[PDB]
């Protein structure tokens, strides 16, 4: 008799949402990038002595699918709002697009702000490319500051590619889902 909770992930195209969900749920890292249209995966986790049957709702980051995405939002217990550290613009798009959308359709649902691809923070090619545009990989303090700005439940960083931090994202999201207030 496990408790069911619904998790929805949102954020810019190619920022790492599917790989995060599939590494967590299957311990596989998909090797070919296919933009998502709509999926709903199953997973299980135990948090604070509670066994949870998680539904993981994967959404399209591409704005081509903006009209379909809200079909995923009803009755959500926790949102993962993702950006990637190699893409400062993916962080800018958090307040520009993702926060207004989720506030419209998911009022009062806890949000975990998640920095994906943390393995790229030190990558020399990423650094070189961003420096040409007078940018840098997203710093932890800037991610945390965005989390405070947008009133997120928490801020966490991970790499689906190495698995660093992945378990903690889902433990914290599950705890947020369990404490959701009405
Ligand atoms: N270096 C690195 N690359 C990653 C990581 N996670 C995903 N990627 C790569 O980033 C690309 C996009 O990853 P996805 O997880 O498919 O991105 P998405 O956010 O689901 O994209 P949409 O479905 O189009 O919204 C792929 O080439 C992945 O292999 C990570 O942790 N580190
Ligand atoms: Mg995807
Ligand atoms: Mg670890």
């Amino acid at each position: 008799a496990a408790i069911r909770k619904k998790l929805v992930v949102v954020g810019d195209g190619a920022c790492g949402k599917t790989c995060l969900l599939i590494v967590f749920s299957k311990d596989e890292f998909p090797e070919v990038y296919v933009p998502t249209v709509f999926e709903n995966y199953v997973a299980d986790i135990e948090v604070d002595g509670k066994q949870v049957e998680l539904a993981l709702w994967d959404t399209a980051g591409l704005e081509d699918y903006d009209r379909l995405r809200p079909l995923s939002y009803p009755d959500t217990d926790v949102i993962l709002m993702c950006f990637s550290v190699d893409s400062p613009d993916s962080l800018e798009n958090i307040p520009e697009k993702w926060v207004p959308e989720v506030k419209h359709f998911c009022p009062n649902v806890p949000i975990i702000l998640v920095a994906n691809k943390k393995d790229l923070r030190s990558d020399e090619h990423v650094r070189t490319e961003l420096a040409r545009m007078k940018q840098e990989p997203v710093r932890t303090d800037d991610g945390r500051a965005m989390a405070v700005r947008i009133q997120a439940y928490d801020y966490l960083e991970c790499s689906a590619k190495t698995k660093e931090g992945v378990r903690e994202v889902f433990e914290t999201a599950t705890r947020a889902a369990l404490q959701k207030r009405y």
Side-chain angles (χ1 to χ4, degrees):
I3 182 158
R4 286 190 69 171
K5 294 294 180 176
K6 173 168 175 175
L7 177 154
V8 176
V9 64
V10 302
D12 281 7
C15 80
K17 298 182 300 297
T18 298
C19 287
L20 176 58
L21 275 49
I22 295 298
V23 165
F24 170 67
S25 62
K26 285 193 138 313
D27 195 17
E28 282 159 28
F29 184 92
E31 221 52 60
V32 181
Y33 173 47
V34 178
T36 303
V37 178
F38 169 86
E39 305 294 343
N40 175 359
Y41 319 120
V42 301
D44 312 279
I45 192 171
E46 173 174 345
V47 179
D48 307 338
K50 294 293 241 173
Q51 193 83 40
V52 179
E53 182 182 326
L54 279 172
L56 306 177
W57 291 65
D58 200 359
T59 70
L62 293 176
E63 71 173 40
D64 314 47
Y65 303 111
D66 276 354
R67 295 177 303 289
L68 166 63
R69 197 176 315 95
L71 299 164
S72 296
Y73 293 136
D75 306 301
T76 295
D77 297 299
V78 62
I79 290 270
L80 299 185
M81 190 174 285
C82 295
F83 67 97
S84 69
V85 306
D86 60 309
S87 172
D89 202 43
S90 73
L91 181 63
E92 288 191 31
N93 288 334
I94 295 290
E96 293 177 13
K97 178 180 181 160
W98 300 111
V99 166
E101 179 166 301
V102 169
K103 285 321 171 173
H104 184 262
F105 293 108
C106 309
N108 317 139
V109 174
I111 297 163
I112 315 306
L113 184 64
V114 177
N116 286 338
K117 315 195 190 183
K118 79 179 295 201
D119 60 284
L120 296 179
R121 178 171 279 141
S122 71
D123 185 82
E124 191 36 78
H125 288 278
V126 173
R127 192 213 66 78
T128 294
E129 297 162 18
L130 291 175
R132 299 194 186 108
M133 321 176 298
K134 310 178 173 141
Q135 299 184 312
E136 63 172 350
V138 180
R139 294 174 51 94
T140 299
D141 56 14
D142 285 344
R144 177 68 65 179
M146 185 67 75
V148 172
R149 175 176 164 196
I150 72 165
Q151 309 191 356
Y153 178 95
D154 209 345
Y155 172 73
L156 292 170
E157 307 191 330
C158 67
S159 169
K161 178 177 172 198
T162 76
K163 304 199 277 197
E164 181 188 0
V166 169
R167 187 185 73 252
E168 289 90 340
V169 167
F170 291 90
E171 290 173 349
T172 299
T174 300
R175 281 205 212 88
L178 285 164
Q179 65 81 67
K180 185 176 71 159
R181 282 153 282 124
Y182 298 94

